[PDB]
Amino acid sequence: NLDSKVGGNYNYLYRLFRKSNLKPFERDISTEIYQAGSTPCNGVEGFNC
Amino acid sequence: NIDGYFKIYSKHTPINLVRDLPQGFSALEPLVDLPIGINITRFQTLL
Ligand SMILES: *[C@@H]1O[C@H](CO)[C@@H](O[C@@H]2O[C@H](CO)[C@@H](O)[C@H](O)[C@H]2NC(C)=O)[C@H](O)[C@H]1NC(C)=O
């Protein structure tokens, strides 16, 4: 009733990629681009970035 | 830094020496526990 919107509420986020699992009570707010492939991203989002 | 908690133990004592830390024994009681939850891999002093 509070967090949903007819057009879709996207204000809540979740981390989808990370090089390793979190240790207990760890907090990670980084926004570094994750390179899922062999091509360096250089801070540019895209395929495998 | 254990489970995101930063433990800082401290101790002080007067000394009279100018070469290195004097030989002796003392205990460092805990003074601060901080709920940072922050990754740590480096530090640097400031003087
Ligand atoms: C905290 O951050 C450090 C980065 O400084 C992480 O250590 C890195 O882990 C990756 C995993 O593949 C390695 O490739 C790097 O060489 C590591 N760097 C160093 C300096 O160790 C560490 O895993 C992070 N830990 C937490 C709990 O977030």
Side-chain angles (χ1 to χ4, degrees), chain A residues 1-18 20-49, chain B residues 2-10 12-18 20-41 43 45-46:
Chain A
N1 60 327
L2 299 174
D3 293 324
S4 298
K5 235 178 180 180
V6 297
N9 182 10
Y10 308 99
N11 305 339
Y12 295 112
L13 314 181
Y14 60 84
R15 187 176 299 278
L16 180 56
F17 297 94
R18 196 171 189 276
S20 61
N21 300 339
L22 297 170
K23 300 176 78 177
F25 294 111
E26 183 187 339
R27 190 164 180 274
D28 183 4
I29 52 74
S30 61
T31 57
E32 183 182 9
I33 308 309
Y34 182 82
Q35 173 182 340
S38 60
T39 303
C41 303
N42 305 328
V44 179
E45 303 178 18
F47 182 72
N48 292 334
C49 289
Chain B
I2 276 60
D3 300 285
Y5 286 82
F6 203 82
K7 300 187 183 60
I8 299 174
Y9 310 72
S10 324
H12 297 340
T13 177
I15 57 166
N16 280 271
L17 184 55
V18 302
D20 58 358
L21 51 83
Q23 184 168 0
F25 180 75
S26 297
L28 286 54
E29 67 205 26
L31 278 200
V32 175
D33 183 5
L34 207 59
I36 54 169
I38 289 294
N39 185 325
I40 184 61
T41 55
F43 78 100
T45 185
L46 303 171

